[PDB]
């Protein structure tokens, strides 16, 4: 075995978040520097009138397609002349911005060495001279398109260290293998076909109109050691920041979701906080056209081709992975089959998760603040369990402020719903001490089990302020 402590697990998740935030901010700032007005004006003169006109074609009403084609020819001519402008293409020192191993990090922490600061001037100078690694090159390419007034995003595949890598060794079996796919690239907006065109002028030297498959998404076990596609962030002229992974992920909901922080709900909410932090403009109609592409993409993925990809899948579950406490919602059935690779003829029943109901016993429901009505049990395990639609909120009874409580003179509060309407919950170890010293008419809160737990008090709201003062003065009792 090769396994680390739950503490190291939790550190890896945090440091992953931290490193990701930094990466994505770097994207944000670099995209700023790309917009520099002094540089733009110099790079514009690189683009002949013929090509410029190709980059801004006239609306063609009878066949929009021909305008798209002219843009593609323009984009191809730009890629070519950029090949010529960029005179010196460096190698990444060490690993560049490709994904690193926990061991590699720990050791870079250790050795401090000497690091030449860059800043904004030095970047500009490099791009104008045409000296840099492929990241600089592509980034420059995007600057140039922008100086021609095309809607040109910078795309960045953020490669933070893997927080799903649990191993204590972390050791790999090549430079050529790392550089096979790019970290940075470009998108360009087609107003005629209402789609984003993908452009990689430096590494793959292609232009693709991604529909369901893209040449840029890395393939083969060896190449994915240093490039694990998780967060593809798009930055635009007007300082938008949009997560565009769905364009580039063939299996987004299966393969890729397991490797992103967004797989639990805390993760998603955190991630959205950062994107919004980085998205400094207001919603345009283009944003909507994109969301429509993503929606259709997100609904054409469908069932995966393997059992491992159906573990903890957002939408889907094999009949065999349905929990003892779940049942199939009346009058639903399998939604699909999975031929199991490497077993002859073996087929599995795939159900949609929306057709699966979670059942709980009466006590468990109460513990979610719900009561039952005359319903029927769905299954027994020996204690009857009921579906969510069998159930109903519990509204506990509401002058002086005596609260009708359980037999023990406490209140069972497993959910905000369960505070009476005219009362408030105050959680504090001594809240009972406070309340007892100044009298009143409170009631202890049982919020969970250890086996009860009185974590605080339930008192009428008019009396809350008093307790808060007494608590603040507890040292004086």
């Amino acid at each position: 075995r090769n396994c680390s402590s739950n503490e190291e697990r939790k550190r890896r998740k945090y440091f992953h978040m931290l490193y990701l935030v930094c990466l994505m901010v770097h994207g944000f700032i670099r995209n700023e520097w790309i917009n520099s007005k002094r540089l733009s004006r110099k790079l514009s003169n690189l683009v002949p009138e013929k090509v410029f006109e190709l980059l801004h074609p006239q609306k063609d009403e009878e066949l929009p397609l021909r305008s798209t084609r002219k843009l593609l020819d323009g984009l191809k001519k730009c890629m070519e002349l950029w090949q010529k402008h960029w005179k010196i293409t460096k190698k990444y020192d060490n690993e560049g911005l490709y994904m690193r191993t926990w061991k590699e990090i720990e050791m870079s922490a250790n050795n401090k060495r000497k690091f030449k600061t860059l800043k904004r001037s030095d970047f500009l100078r490099a791009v104008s001279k045409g000296h840099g690694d492929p990241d600089i090159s592509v980034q420059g390419f995007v600057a140039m398109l922008r100086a021609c007034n095309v809607n040109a995003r910078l795309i960045m595949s953020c490669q933070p260290p893997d927080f799903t890598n649990m191993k204590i060794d972390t050791s790999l079996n090549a430079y050529k293998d790392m550089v096979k796919y790019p970290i940075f690239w470009c998108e360009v907006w087609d107003k005629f076909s209402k789609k984003w065109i993908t452009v990689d002028p430096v590494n793959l030297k292609t232009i693709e109109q991604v529909r369901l498959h893209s040449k840029l998404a890395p393939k083969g076990v060896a190449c994915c050691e240093r490039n694990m596609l998780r967060y593809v962030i798009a930055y635009d002229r007007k300082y938008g920041c949009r997560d565009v992974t769905r364009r580039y992920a063939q299996w987004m909901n299966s393969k890729v979701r397991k490797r992103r922080i967004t797989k639990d709900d805390f993760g998603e909410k955190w991630f959205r906080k950062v994107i919004t932090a980085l998205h400094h403009r207001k919603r345009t109609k283009i944003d909507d056209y994109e969301d429509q592409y993503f929606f259709r993409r997100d609904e054409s993925e469908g069932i995966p081709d393997s059992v491992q990809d159906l573990k903890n899948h957002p939408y889907y579950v094999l009949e065999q992975d349905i929990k003892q406490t779940q049942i199939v919602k009346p009058g639903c059935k399998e939604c699909g089959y999975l031929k199991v690779h490497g077993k002859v003829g073996k087929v599995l029943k795939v159900y949609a998760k929306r057709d699966i109901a979670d059942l709980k016993s009466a006590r468990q429901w109460y513990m979610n603040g719900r009561i039952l009505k005359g319903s029927r049990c769905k299954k027994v395990i020996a204690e009857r369990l009921y579906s969510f639609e069998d159930t109903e909120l519990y509204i506990p009874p509401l002058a002086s402020g005596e609260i009708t409580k359980n037999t023990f003179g406490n209140i069972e509060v497993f959910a905000p719903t369960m505070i009476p309407g005219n009362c408030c919950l105050v959680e504090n170890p001594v809240a009972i001490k406070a309340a007892r010293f100044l009298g009143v008419e409170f009631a202890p809160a049982v919020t969970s089990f250890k086996k009860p737990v009185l974590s605080g008090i339930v008192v009428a709201k008019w009396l809350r302020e008093a307790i808060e003062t007494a608590i603040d003065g507890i040292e004086f009792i």
Partner: protein, 57 residues
């Protein structure tokens, strides 16, 4: 939930022009600011904006 301005500046500068070198700085600063950890979990957007407006310029 807070940090000096000498560290916030150096960190903006690494993040902006030399992110390859992030690793040891973050190790350091995280070792000098325990509370930063839980901050980052609750309120990332603040730490972001802090890294964005070192441009009081």
């Amino acid at each position: 939930a807070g940090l000096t301005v000498e560290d916030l500046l150096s960190l903006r500068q690494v993040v902006s022009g030399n992110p390859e070198a992030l690793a040891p700085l973050l190790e350091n600063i995280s070792a000098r600011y325990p509370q930063l950890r839980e901050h980052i979990m609750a309120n990332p957007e603040v730490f972001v904006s802090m890294l964005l407006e070192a441009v009081g310029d």
